[PDB]
Amino acid sequence: EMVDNLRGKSGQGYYVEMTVGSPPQTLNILVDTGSSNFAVGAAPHPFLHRYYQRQLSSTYRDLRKGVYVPYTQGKWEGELGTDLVSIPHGPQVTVRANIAAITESDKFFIQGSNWEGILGLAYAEIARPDDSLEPFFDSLVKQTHVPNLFSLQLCASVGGSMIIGGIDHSLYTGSLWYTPIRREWYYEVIIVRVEINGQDLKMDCKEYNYDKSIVDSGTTNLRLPKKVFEAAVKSIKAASSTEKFPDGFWLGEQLVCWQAGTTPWNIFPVISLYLMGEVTQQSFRITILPQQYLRPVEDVATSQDDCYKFAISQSSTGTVMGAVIMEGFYVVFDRARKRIGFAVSACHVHDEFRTAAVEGPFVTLDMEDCGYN
Ligand SMILES: CCNc1cc(C(=O)N[C@@H](Cc2ccccc2)[C@H](O)CN[C@@H](C)C(=O)NC2CCCCC2)cc(N2CCCC2=O)c1
């Protein structure tokens, strides 16, 4: 009953239905492995269909403390409190959890996204105002018998599944490969190698993780450190040089469009990210097709064409493996064993020539630690 419990619009996040308060108020909540605060719209806003009414909840408790959360995209401020929370299409449990009631925001809520709140699934270490504000998943595990693990299968309308407390074998094929959670704050991982159509970018592997690499369902793009970004774009340009695009396309400032049904997928390369294994000097790779990193932009005005944004972009805060990377993989956040597992999803991306893949093992001769710090 947890399969197909996520919905979304492309580029706008994936969300799960939740209830807050007593009697229960239903809200759609974006699933975010890149933050650790649970927060809901709690005042009218132009892009909110509905919001949390604390005055109607007899179980609401005010903590008399404000909070401010800035993301890469957007920011909000609100009042901290606690209340009862359920997940109708999740484990049938009720937990009392910290909730930030958002009362002001800037560029956070998205016109027509269908969600009214955000569920930060990462660790206390990055919660605001500080790590004493226990995150939702921690409360769920402490207060119920739910095992300390969840999995995400992310697939304009989109869908997928969040399996809370377990792994659903019907959602993936082949083997699950595990990479260590380096540090419990973000879901921090280590990238050891990057290839563009099988050609190594040939950088010191620390560059891939300058200054951290994270797995983030709340960010859309694959975001890369400047030096890695520039090298990657050069290589993708070279692979695709049968066609020439404006510089603005490569910067995400501009769409690329082709007559409907004629997108030349085959001129764009596959990107392989090699992730650190659980054993010394071993790795595995996840392979990303252009159908993942060229993100379709739905717009009836442009619909004689298929139009796309380049969904790899630059970062000054390390690698972000966003939703564009997670799509078509089954990703297991195995908190109990401090590891992240990847497998090919039941909704994997593939055409008649190429397929997304998770494969290993690979060995490196180079004994260098790829961690930046
Ligand atoms: C799905 C929306 N698309 C979209 C959202 C974000 C974004 O900032 N996502 C946040 C959630 C969200 C979801 C929806 C709306 C706003 C924010 C994540 O939480 C960000 N995760 C990390 C990187 C972070 O900044 N964590 C903070 C650290 C400080 C303490 C709080 C957590 C970024 C992009 N970007 C930015 C450039 C390229 C890209 O894809 C596109």
- Extract the tokens encoding 27: 């809200």
CA of 76 to the centre of ligand 1 (A): 12
Q: Whose CA is nearest to atom 21 of ligand 1?
A: 34
191, HSE (Cβ side, Cα atoms, 13 Å): 32
How many other CB atoms sit within 10 Å of the CB of residue 49? 13
Q: How far is residue 128's CA from residue 107's CA, in Å, rounded to a whole number?
A: 19
Spacing of C-alpha 330 from chain mean position: 12
Sheet of 199-200, strand order: 199-200, 191-196, 271-276, 282-288, 357-363
Residue 288 is classified by DSSP as: E
- Report the Cα–Cα distance between both ends of the chain, in Å, rounded: 42
1 in any annotated domain: no
- Pocket (CB within 6 angstroms of ligand 1): 12-13, 30, 32, 34-35, 69, 71-74, 108, 126, 128, 216, 218-221, 223, 313, 320, 322
In this structure, the answer to whether residues 240 and 361 fall within a common structural domain is yes
In this structure, the answer to whether residues 116 and 204 fall within a common structural domain is no
Which residues belong to the active site?
A: 32, 216
CA of 314 to the centre of ligand 1 (A): 14
CB 67 within 8 A of CB 77: yes
Q: How far is residue 241's CA from residue 235's CA, in Å, rounded to a whole number?
A: 10
Could you write out the DSSP letters of every residue in 103-164? EEEES-S-TT----EEEE-S-GGG-SS-TTS--HHHHHHHHS---S-EEEEE--EEEEEEEE
Instruction: Quickly tell me which residue has 């005005």 as its tokens.
Output: 301
In this structure, the answer to whether residues 230 and 267 fall within a common structural domain is yes
Q: Where are the alpha helices (DSSP H) in 12-70?
A: none
At residue 138's C-alpha, the angle toward residues 52 and 92, to 5°, is 65
CB 223 within 8 A of CB 212: no
7 in any annotated domain: no
**Residue 358 region by backbone torsions, left for phi larger than 0, else alpha for psi between -120 and 50, else beta:** beta
In this structure, the answer to whether residues 219 and 244 fall within a common structural domain is yes
Residue 253 is part of which domain span?
Answer: 147-373
Pocket test for ligand 1, best of 72, 294, 297 (most atoms within 8 A of CB): 72
In this structure, the answer to whether residues 205 and 331 fall within a common structural domain is yes
In this structure, the answer to whether residues 38 and 168 fall within a common structural domain is no
Q: Which atom of ligand 1 is nearest to the CA of 324?
A: 40
Spacing of C-alpha 143 from chain mean position: 26
In this structure, the answer to whether residues 66 and 162 fall within a common structural domain is no
Beta bridge partners of 151: 163, 332
Q: How far is residue 318's CA from residue 310's CA, in Å, rounded to a whole number?
A: 19
3-state secondary structure of 238: helix
Dihedral of CA atoms 103, 80, 6, 277 in degrees, nearest 10, equals 130
Task: Collect all residues with Cβ–Cβ distance below 8 Å to 207 and sequence separation of at least 6.
Answer: 225, 227, 228
- Extract the tokens encoding 272: 């392989």
In this structure, the answer to whether residues 231 and 342 fall within a common structural domain is yes
- Extract the tokens encoding 286: 């996840």
- Extract the tokens encoding 307: 């139009």
3-state secondary structure of 47: coil
307 in any annotated domain: yes
- Extract the tokens encoding 364: 């490196």
In this structure, the answer to whether residues 141 and 155 fall within a common structural domain is no
82 in any annotated domain: yes
CB 123 within 8 A of CB 184: yes
- Please identify, among 107, 131, 146, the residue that sits at the C-terminal boundary of a domain: 146
| Length of the chain (residues) | 373
Q: How far is residue 12's CA from residue 108's CA, in Å, rounded to a whole number?
A: 11
Q: Whose CA is nearest to atom 12 of ligand 1?
A: 218
Residue 170 is classified by DSSP as: G
Task: Collect all residues with Cβ–Cβ distance below 8 Å to 270 and sequence separation of at least 6.
Answer: 196, 197, 198, 287, 288, 289, 290, 354
348 in any annotated domain: yes
For the chain, the farthest-separated pair of C-alpha atoms sits apart, in whole angstroms, at 64
2 in any annotated domain: no
Q: Is residue 55 exposed (0-12), middle (13-18) or buried (19+ Cβ within 10 Å)? A: exposed
CB 171 within 8 A of CB 124: no
Q: How far is residue 111's CA from residue 54's CA, in Å, rounded to a whole number?
A: 24
In this structure, the answer to whether residues 167 and 190 fall within a common structural domain is yes
Pocket test for ligand 1, best of 219, 224, 327 (most atoms within 8 A of CB): 219
- Please identify, among 112, 146, 180, the residue that sits at the C-terminal boundary of a domain: 146
In this structure, the answer to whether residues 153 and 237 fall within a common structural domain is yes
- Please identify, among 146, 178, 200, the residue that sits at the C-terminal boundary of a domain: 146
6 in any annotated domain: no
In this structure, the answer to whether residues 295 and 198 fall within a common structural domain is yes
Q: Which of 204, 257, 200, 236 is nearest to 313 (CA)?
A: 236
Q: How far is residue 291's CA from residue 248's CA, in Å, rounded to a whole number?
A: 20
CATH number at residue 235: 2.40.70.10
Q: Is the peptide bond before 269 cis (omega within 30 degrees of 0)?
A: no
CA of 220 to the centre of ligand 1 (A): 8
5 in any annotated domain: no
- Extract the tokens encoding 257: 């469009």
Total domains, the chain: 2
Q: Whose CA is nearest to atom 11 of ligand 1?
A: 218
| Resolution of the structure, angstroms | 1.8
The approach used to solve this structure was: X-ray
Dihedral of CA atoms 296, 297, 301, 307 in degrees, nearest 10, equals -40
CB 211 within 8 A of CB 228: no
Q: Whose CA is nearest to atom 32 of ligand 1?
A: 35
How many other CB atoms sit within 10 Å of the CB of residue 258? 13
Q: How far is residue 272's CA from residue 292's CA, in Å, rounded to a whole number?
A: 12
